[PDB]
Amino acid sequence: VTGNNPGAQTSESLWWVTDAGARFGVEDSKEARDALGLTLTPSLAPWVALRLLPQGPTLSRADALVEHDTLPMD
Amino acid sequence: SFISPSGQLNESPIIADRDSGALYVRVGDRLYPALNLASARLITGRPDNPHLVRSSQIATMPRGPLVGIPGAPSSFSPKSPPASSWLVCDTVATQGVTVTVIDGTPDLTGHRQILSGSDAVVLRYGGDAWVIREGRRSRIEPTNRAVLLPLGLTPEQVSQARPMSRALFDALPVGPELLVPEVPNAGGPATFPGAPGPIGTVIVTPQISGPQQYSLVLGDGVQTLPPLVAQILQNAAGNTKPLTVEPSTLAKMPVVNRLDLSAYPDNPLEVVDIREHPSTCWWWERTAGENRARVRVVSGPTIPVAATEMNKVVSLVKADTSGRQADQVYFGPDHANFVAVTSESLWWVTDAGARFGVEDSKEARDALGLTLTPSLAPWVALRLLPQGPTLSRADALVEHDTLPMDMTPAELVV
Amino acid sequence: PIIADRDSGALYVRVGDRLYPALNLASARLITGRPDNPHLVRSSQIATMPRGPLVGIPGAPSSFSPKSPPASSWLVCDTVATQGVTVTVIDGTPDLTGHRQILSGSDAVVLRYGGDAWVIREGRRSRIEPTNRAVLLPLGLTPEQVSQARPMSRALFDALP
Amino acid sequence: SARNVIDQRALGAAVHYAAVDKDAVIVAAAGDGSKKDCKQNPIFDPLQPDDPRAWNAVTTVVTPSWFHDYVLTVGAVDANGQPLSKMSIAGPWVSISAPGTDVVGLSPRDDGLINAIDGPDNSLLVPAGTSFSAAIVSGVAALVRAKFPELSAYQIINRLIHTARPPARGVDNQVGYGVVDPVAALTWDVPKGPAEPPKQLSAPLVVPQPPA
Amino acid sequence: LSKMSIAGPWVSISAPGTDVVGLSPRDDGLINAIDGPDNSLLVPAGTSFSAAIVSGVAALVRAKFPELSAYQIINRLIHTARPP
Amino acid sequence: PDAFSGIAPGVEIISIRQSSQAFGLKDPYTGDEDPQTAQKIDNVETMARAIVHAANMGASVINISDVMCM
Amino acid sequence: ISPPTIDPGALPPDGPPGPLAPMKQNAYCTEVGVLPGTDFQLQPKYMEMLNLNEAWQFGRGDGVKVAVIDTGVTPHPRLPRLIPGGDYVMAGGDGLSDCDAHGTLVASMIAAVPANGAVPLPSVPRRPV
C-alpha cells in the first residue's frame, strides 16, 4: 500500500490478493515471509483502489497454531 | 504420461489442481472454489472423487466466490459391521475423573474382568453412595446397619468411596434401593384360613434334606424368601425367632409372589478394590436382527484397550465445561461410521470424532453415497460426541466472501 | 511434513508424531514452517497413524504463485444504466482499442453528486452551479444540460482529486 | 504501573467537560519508551479472541491517553512508513499515528533554526518520538475544523480515523487505525455515522436449470 | 548457579535457591516479588534462601537424635549428601 | 486453599535484628578511617555480640543469612 | 485493568494558575545547536508524506485557536500570534519561557510562518534566561 497522489513514495503494509478477489494481510516478520514463500519484492498499489476489495483474516504463524473441535456455521 | 503425470479437463464436475490440491467445482460455465469434498459432492449431486487437472488449464476458466459448508467432513468410506459395540468408560485420578468413549470390540485380557455375580463396586455421586452390580445401580445409606451388616458393607467403606462421572451415572439404569422391604398392612389379620400369624410375620419350616425354607405372611398369603433376605427382616427390633411350622400345613397354604427381591444378592458382596481397578466401563452389545441389546459392566486396572494401540487415542478439545461431553475417543477394530438411532435419526461419525446429521431423503442418500443400511447405536453414548451442521442439499448452495471466526479455540503445542 | 490422500484428496499436516487434518494449504505452511507442496500418499498408510482435531485458519487462500509484472496498473470504473451504477475494479493494462478514448483537451463530462454538478476535465473534478448564466454560456453549457446530468458513484467521487 | 494506580476522578471529570460541554478536540502523545517509568505493553493474542484490544494484559497505564472515548492518541512511525517499534508504548488506547523523525523547529534563546539539544555531556542529542507526532496530528485537525465548521468533535475524529491507511491487522495497538492522510480527510465523502458490522455474509447460489 | 554464588574453599553443602515463596510483611497473604528501585517488580533468589532450607533440615535431625553433639550432627548431613 | 508451609512447622524461632540498609549514622564524619571501611569494622563487632547473645538465649540452631564480603 | 469510568461531580474549581506549594529552580536551562552538515534549504523529509502543497489549497487554517499544554513557549519573530496563558510551576510566570527547550519545538512545528524578505514584527523585547 502507498499514497494516492502522483508523487507518493511510501510503502506501509503488505497484502495478498487472490484471483477470487479477496485481500489477506501478511505480517512482515521474517518467519511469516519465509514460511509462505514471499521473500520477494512487492508491487505498489494505491489505497483508493485497493480498499474496495473485501478483507479476510490476517496470516501469521501465531494465528494458525490453534485447534477446533467443530467450526461455527453462520 | 508415466514420466510426467498431468491431466486434462473432462466432463466430470469435480476437479482438483494437481500442483496444489485446491478443490474446485463447476456449475454452468464457471468454476467455484469449494471448501471441502462433502459440499462439492452435495452441490453437484454425483458421489465421486476429484479429477486431477493441470494448473495451466484451470487458469483459463472464469471464477466465482467460495461455496459449501465450512468444517464439513473431507473423506468418505462407508463401513457397517454385523456386530455393533459401544462403551462409555471413565478413569479415576490417584479428585477428578476423565471420560473415554470407545467404538468397537473391547479387550478383556489381563486383570480385566466382568462385574458379574457377587462382585460389586461402590461409587459416590450427588451426595449419595451407589452400589453397581448385574448391570444396574442402586442407592444405599451409611446409617442403615440392619442392611449393611448382613450385606457385608461397612460405614467407613460406604462414606469413603470415590466419585463417579455424570456420563456414567446417566448410562447406568437405576434399580430399587437397598432398603428394608416394607410389608403393607403389617400386623394386620391374614385373609386366608389357617394363617400361622398376622401380616408381616416370618415363618420357617425344616426339611429332611437341605436348608430350612423361610417365608413371609402377606395380606393374600405367604411369600418364600431367600436366607440373606430373611436376615434383614430378622435383624430389624422385632420377634426373637421366626414361626416354626409343619411342612404339610405350609404346603397346603396359599403361595404368593407379590414383593420383589431383585436387589438383594445371594451372599455378602465381593467389593472390588478401586485402587487396583481405577477404571470401570459400561458395555452395550447388539447383533443385527436381535430383539434387544445386551448390557454389561467391566472393570480393570486400565481402559479396555490393547497396550499396543494405547498410544493412538484421540484427545478432544471439549470446549463445553458441562458434563454432557467426553474427553477422549477411541476407534477400535470393526467400528461403525454410518449409524442410525431410535422417527429414527441418521448420523455420520468422522475419524476426528465429530458427528454430523444426514438427511433421510434420496437426495442426500444419493449425492453423498451412504445408500447402504446403517448400523444401530445407543443415544446415551453417541450424544457424548461434539456435533457439526447437517449435510442437507439446501445448506451447501451458499456463497461466501469471508467466513466467521471461532470464538473459543485451543492451543496446538509442537 | 505436508501430505495429501492420493484418493480422497484430503490434506494432512504432521506435528510431532500425530497427523492433523488441515483446513487449507495456507495454514499448513505456517504450521510446518516450510514452503512445500502436498505430497501424495497411499490412503492405506494414512489410516495407520494417530489423528488429532482440525487445525488452521478457516477460509485462508489455497494456492500461492507470486508474480511481479514490469508495471503496475489499476483502474476504478463507474458505469451507469437506464439510474443506478455499478463499480468495477480492473487490475492490469486497460484495453483502449475501438471507440474508447482518453479524456484530454477540450473534451469534458458532467456528473451529479450530493445535488451539486461537477465538471471533469484535465484529470480533476471542479464544481459548477446551474444558476450562473454568465459562466455557463461562454463555456458552452446550458442550464438544462447541467440539470439533466447523471449520478456519480462514491468510489469515483473519492478517487478523482 | 498497572499496580497501585492513582485516583484520577478529578482528571476524568475535566476531560469529559472539555470534550462534551465545550466541544474541544484533545490530541495526546502515546508516550516515549525513553521516559523514566514507561515500559512496553503486550499486544494482541490470537488464542483469546475475547477482547481484540487485550485490555486484561495491560501492564503500564498512560494518562490522560487512557480515556480512549474522548481523547485521540497518536503513535509514531519513521519517515518511510515503518512503526518505531522501539519507542512507542503501543497500548490498547492508541488510535492513529504520524511521522516523528528529522524534527526541525525554531530555536529558543536564539534567532534561527535548530536540530539538536545538548545532552548530559559533550554529546549533542537529536530529538525524536511521539511528542512530535502529536504536534503533526494537531495541525491537520486544525485545517479540517476550519473547512467543516458545522461538525462536532466526535464527528471530526471519525473523519480522520476512517481516512487513514491501515496496517495488516486492520487495527493494531502499535499504530491504531493507521497513518494520517491530510488530503483524504479534507475531501472524501466519509459516512456520518459510526462503524457498524454487516448483518450477514452469506448469499444463495443461483444454480442453473438442469437439462431435460 | 555458577553465575550467582561465591565458590570459596569453605563451601561445604548446597540446597535449592529458586522459586522462593513466603508470607507477606505488611499484609496477610503470600508474595513472590519485591518492588525494585524502579517501578520494576524484582524477584528474590540466592544463597540467603538456601541457608534457610538447611536450617530447617538441621532442626529436624537434632530433634530425632538429641544425644548427638553439634560436631556429630554436621557429619551426619555431610556424609549423606549426593556428591559432585 | 494454600499449599505453602514451612520445613519444620513445630519449631520456635527467636528474632534478632542486626543489619539493615534503611538506617544510617547521624554524624557521618568518621575521622582517620575512610567512611566505607569504617562501616565494616562496626558490622564485625556488632555481629560477634549478636552470636553470643543468641547462644545465651538457649538457641540450638543459629541461622545467619546476611554475610559480609571483604 | 478495566476501562475508566467518570464522575462529573468532581470537577476542580476554576481559578488563576499557581503551584500547589512553593517551588524553586534547581538546574540551568539546556543549550541547543545544529548538527554538522545540515542544510535548511531542503524541505524536511517528514513533509513528503503530508503533501501540504496540495492540502493548503483550501486555506492555511485562519481563525483557529490551538492550546499547547507543555513547558511553555518562548516568543520568536516567526510566531506573530502567540498568547500567554499562565504558569503552574512558578507563581509569577506567564507561561512564556521554555527552559527545557521543548515547548518551542512543538509550537513552532505547528504554526511557524514561512520565510519572507522582512519580518512583520522586527522588535525583540524578550528577557534573558
Author numbering:
A (entry chain B4): 423 to 496
B (entry chain B1): 74 to 167, 175 to 316, 319 to 424, 433 to 504
C (entry chain B4): 86 to 167, 175 to 253
D (entry chain P3): 336 to 547
E (entry chain P1): 419 to 502
F (entry chain P1): 266 to 335
G (entry chain P3): 40 to 168
Paper text:
Specialized protein transport systems—known as type VII secretion systems (T7SSs)—are central to the virulence of this pathogen, and are also crucial for nutrient and metabolite transport across the mycobacterial cell envelope. Mycobacterium tuberculosis encodes five homologous, but functionally distinct, T7SSs that are designated ESX-1 to ESX-5. These systems translocate a number of effector proteins across the unique and impermeable diderm cell envelope. Here we reconstituted the ESX-5 T7SS of M. tuberculosis H37Rv in M. smegmatis to obtain a structural view of the entire T7SS membrane complex from this human pathogen.
The periplasmic assembly of the ESX-5 membrane complex of M. tuberculosis is formed by three EccB5 dimers and three MycP5 proteases. The EccB5 dimers assemble in a triangle, which forms a central cavity. Within an EccB5 dimer, two slightly different conformations (that is, inner and outer) can be distinguished between monomers, depending on their position. EccB5 dimerization is mediated mainly through the R1 and R4 repeat domains and is further stabilized by the EccB5 C termini, which wrap around their interacting EccB5 partner to form intermolecular hydrophobic contacts with its R1 domain. To form the triangle-shaped assembly, the inner EccB5 engages the outer EccB5 of the adjacent dimer by packing its R3 domain against the α-helices α5 and α8 of domains R2 and R3, respectively, which results in an asymmetric EccB5–tip arrangement. Our periplasmic M. tuberculosis ESX-5 map shows three MycP5 proteases that form a dome-like structure, which cap the periplasmic central cavity. Interactions between EccB5 and MycP5 are mediated mainly by the MycP5 protease domain and a composite interface that is generated by the R4 domain and loop 6 (residues Thr424 to Ser435) of the inner EccB5. The MycP5–EccB5 interface covers a surface area of about 1,230 Å2, which leads to the burial of three conserved tryptophan residues (Trp437 and Trp469 of EccB5, and Trp523 of MycP5). MycP5–MycP5 interactions are mediated mainly through loop 1 and the N-terminal extension (which run across the top of the MycP5 protomers), and loop 3, which contacts the neighbouring protease domain from the side. The active sites of the MycP5 proteases face towards the central lumen of the cavity, which implies that potential substrates of this protease are translocated through—and processed within—this periplasmic chamber.
